[PDB]
Amino acid sequence: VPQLDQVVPQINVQVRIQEVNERALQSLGLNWRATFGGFNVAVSGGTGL
């Protein structure tokens, strides 16, 4: 009995959960159309020449 009735420790536990996210985007595009004699040229990004 003296051993099973002793004081046991009391504790406080701290947990920290930390989460960080970052992003970065960068677009750039030229999209033209030229018309000289007889010719018709169109340059884009989706379709090419």
């Binding site: 051993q3 099973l4 002793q6 046991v8």
Partner: peptide, 29 residues
């Protein structure tokens, strides 16, 4: 037989109860 084992979760105590030979075997483990 085999020695009686008593486990207390609150105090983390192991209690072995048996013949003196059966108790010295747990004591060395």
């Amino acid at each position: 037989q085999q020695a009686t084992l008593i486990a207390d979760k609150r105090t983390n105590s192991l209690i072995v109860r048996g013949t003196p030979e059966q108790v010295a075997q747990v004591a060395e483990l």
